[PDB]
Design an enzyme around this catalytic site. Structure first.
Site, PDB file in Angstrom:
ATOM      1  N   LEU A  23     -21.484 -15.333  42.125  1.00  0.00           N
ATOM      2  CA  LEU A  23     -22.052 -14.755  41.182  1.00  0.00           C
ATOM      3  C   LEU A  23     -20.645 -14.648  39.979  1.00  0.00           C
ATOM      4  CD1 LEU A  23     -22.274 -11.141  42.532  1.00  0.00           C
ATOM      5  CD2 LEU A  23     -23.697 -13.360  42.507  1.00  0.00           C
ATOM      6  N   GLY A  24     -19.614 -15.133  40.451  1.00  0.00           N
ATOM      7  CA  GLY A  24     -19.054 -15.461  38.996  1.00  0.00           C
ATOM      8  C   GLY A  24     -17.366 -16.511  38.891  1.00  0.00           C
ATOM      9  N   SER A  25     -17.273 -17.260  38.387  1.00  0.00           N
ATOM     10  CA  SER A  25     -16.220 -18.326  37.993  1.00  0.00           C
ATOM     11  C   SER A  25     -15.235 -18.223  37.408  1.00  0.00           C
ATOM     12  CB  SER A  25     -16.157 -19.636  38.203  1.00  0.00           C
ATOM     13  OG  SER A  25     -16.855 -20.132  39.677  1.00  0.00           O
ATOM     14  N   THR A  26     -13.395 -15.751  41.029  1.00  0.00           N
ATOM     15  CA  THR A  26     -14.425 -16.262  42.335  1.00  0.00           C
ATOM     16  C   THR A  26     -14.747 -15.075  42.329  1.00  0.00           C
ATOM     17  OG1 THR A  26     -13.068 -17.912  41.938  1.00  0.00           O
ATOM     18  CG2 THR A  26     -15.322 -18.227  43.730  1.00  0.00           C
ATOM     19  N   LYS A  46     -13.891 -10.466  45.787  1.00  0.00           N
ATOM     20  CA  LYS A  46     -13.215 -10.773  44.873  1.00  0.00           C
ATOM     21  C   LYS A  46     -12.334 -12.021  45.292  1.00  0.00           C
ATOM     22  CE  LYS A  46     -10.829  -9.477  40.667  1.00  0.00           C
ATOM     23  NZ  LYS A  46     -10.825  -8.264  39.607  1.00  0.00           N
ATOM     24  N   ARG A 142     -18.884  -3.859  29.449  1.00  0.00           N
ATOM     25  CA  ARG A 142     -18.883  -5.437  29.938  1.00  0.00           C
ATOM     26  C   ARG A 142     -18.140  -4.660  31.471  1.00  0.00           C
ATOM     27  NH1 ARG A 142     -14.156  -6.052  26.277  1.00  0.00           N
ATOM     28  NH2 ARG A 142     -12.537  -5.332  26.919  1.00  0.00           N
ATOM     29  N   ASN A 143     -17.207  -3.383  31.374  1.00  0.00           N
ATOM     30  CA  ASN A 143     -16.589  -3.084  32.996  1.00  0.00           C
ATOM     31  C   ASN A 143     -17.018  -1.934  33.234  1.00  0.00           C
ATOM     32  OD1 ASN A 143     -14.467  -4.674  32.266  1.00  0.00           O
ATOM     33  ND2 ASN A 143     -13.244  -3.732  31.447  1.00  0.00           N
ATOM     34  N   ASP A 156     -13.230  -2.494  36.854  1.00  0.00           N
ATOM     35  CA  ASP A 156     -11.996  -3.160  35.795  1.00  0.00           C
ATOM     36  C   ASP A 156     -10.737  -1.882  36.141  1.00  0.00           C
ATOM     37  OD1 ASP A 156     -10.161  -5.299  34.220  1.00  0.00           O
ATOM     38  OD2 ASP A 156     -11.736  -6.277  34.107  1.00  0.00           O
TER      39      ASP A 156
HETATM   40  C1  LIG Z   1     -16.485  -1.279  41.362  1.00  0.00           C
HETATM   41  C2  LIG Z   1     -17.117  -2.753  42.146  1.00  0.00           C
HETATM   42  C3  LIG Z   1     -17.739  -4.158  41.445  1.00  0.00           C
HETATM   43  O1  LIG Z   1     -16.981  -4.928  41.279  1.00  0.00           O
HETATM   44  N1  LIG Z   1     -18.585  -4.183  42.108  1.00  0.00           N
HETATM   45  C4  LIG Z   1     -19.796  -5.954  41.305  1.00  0.00           C
HETATM   46  C5  LIG Z   1     -19.184  -6.769  40.770  1.00  0.00           C
HETATM   47  C6  LIG Z   1     -19.790  -7.589  40.819  1.00  0.00           C
HETATM   48  C7  LIG Z   1     -18.883  -8.719  39.532  1.00  0.00           C
HETATM   49  C8  LIG Z   1     -17.261  -8.538  39.788  1.00  0.00           C
HETATM   50  C9  LIG Z   1     -16.385  -9.605  38.674  1.00  0.00           C
HETATM   51  C10 LIG Z   1     -16.983  -9.712  37.570  1.00  0.00           C
HETATM   52  C11 LIG Z   1     -18.515  -9.841  38.070  1.00  0.00           C
HETATM   53  C12 LIG Z   1     -19.094  -9.349  38.784  1.00  0.00           C
HETATM   54  C13 LIG Z   1     -20.713  -8.286  40.730  1.00  0.00           C
HETATM   55  C14 LIG Z   1     -20.985  -6.831  41.626  1.00  0.00           C
HETATM   56  N2  LIG Z   1     -20.201  -6.078  42.280  1.00  0.00           N
END
Ligand SMILES: */C=C/C(=O)Nc1cc(-c2ccccc2)ccn1
Length: 306
Positions: A23-25, A26, A46, A142-143, A156
């Site tokens: 989902l993200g770059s 991990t 994460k 964003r958060n 975050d």
């Molecule tokens: C607080 C729960 C959470 O973070 N759930 C989450 C997080 C993402 C995410 C994390 C970091 C960057 C982008 C996206 C995706 C889906 N659920």
């Protein structure tokens, strides 16, 4: 004295969960299966990068400390951590991503009811964080994450500071910072309170009512202090009535105690969410609508541990 934090930190085996995709770059999308529980919980994992950088591990377990110490429907639950070569935070998967990318991608589909509910739920989340004597210090669109378009959670807690039994504002010292979301007192003297969170709540609402426009876009962060001391603020978004925008302006008063209390913001947006069309004016508003055996799948939110 202060309240003992009796929060449980759950340590999970690597075998309890399956990494599905990135989902993200991990950050991975995965599934968690509590040992002999017959429940499958969608998770976002994460995982640390180098995971030999001691200072990076401090951060991530500090995120974990805060995330384990929160239990509110508008703030995201930490389900546990895995103590592997590379530390893994295991959280509730918020499938629809950051509210910021959400309003960007779906501006054509987002009616007043949803925007104003988002303003309430975020304010409930934040008012919970004030109840728990906790300053977020990085609240932005964003958060905020989207479990469904009907339900968002604040995220975050990498900058969240757990206030003292008498620590009037959280003093800090240097790093990369959210200038364009920050209370004037935080830019100038690194003062952060529940009130300076409210300010960032105002920039967060501005972002949502502009369907994800960049605050003070093209203005260097160096001047933002001088601009705000000169009395300048973010402009009234098109879709916004004087009413809504006037709540945003109130969040950006220089007198911190003159800004609204999160518990107040709940009430005010709640009132407006009762008659959304009277408070936010959007082209085609009423028109608007939004959304491998998974037999034992259960959302994090229906998974309770005592
Ligand atoms: C607080 C729960 C959470 O973070 N759930 C989450 C997080 C993402 C995410 C994390 C970091 C960057 C982008 C996206 C995706 C889906 N659920």
């Amino acid at each position: 004295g202060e309240a003992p934090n009796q929060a449980l930190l759950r340590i999970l085996k690597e075998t309890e969960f399956k990494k599905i995709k990135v989902l993200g770059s991990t950050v991975y999308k995965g599934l968690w299966i509590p040992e002999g529980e017959k429940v499958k919980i969608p998770v976002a994992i994460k995982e640390l990068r180098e995971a030999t950088s001691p200072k990076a591990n401090k951060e991530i377990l500090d995120e974990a400390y805060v995330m384990a110490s929160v239990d509110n429907p508008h703030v995201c639950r930490l389900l546990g951590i895995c103590l592997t070569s590379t530390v893994q935070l295991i959280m509730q998967l918020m499938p629809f991503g950051s509210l910021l990318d959400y309003v960007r991608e779906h501006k054509d589909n987002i009616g007043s009811q949803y925007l104003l509910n988002w303003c309430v739920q975020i304010a409930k989340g934040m008012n919970y964080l004030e109840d728990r004597r906790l300053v977020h210090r990085d609240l932005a669109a964003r958060n905020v994450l989207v479990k469904t378009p009907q339900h968002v959670k604040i995220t975050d807690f990498g900058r969240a500071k757990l206030l003292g039994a008498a620590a009037a504002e959280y003093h800090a010292e240097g790093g990369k910072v959210p200038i364009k979301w920050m209370a004037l007192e935080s830019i100038l003297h690194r003062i952060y309170t529940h009130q300076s969170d409210v300010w960032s709540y105002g920039v967060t609402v501005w972002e949502l009512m502009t369907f994800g426009s960049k605050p003070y876009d093209g203005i260097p962060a160096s001047e933002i202090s001088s601009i705000l001391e000169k009395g300048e603020r973010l402009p009234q978004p098109p879709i916004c009535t004087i009413d809504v925008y006037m709540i945003m302006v109130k969040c950006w008063m220089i007198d911190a105690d003159s800004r609204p209390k999160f518990r107040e913001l709940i009430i005010e947006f709640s009132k407006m969410a009762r008659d959304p069309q009277r408070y936010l004016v959007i082209q085609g508003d009423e028109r608007m609508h939004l959304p491998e055996d998974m037999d034992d799948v259960v959302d994090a939110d229906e998974y309770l541990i005592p």
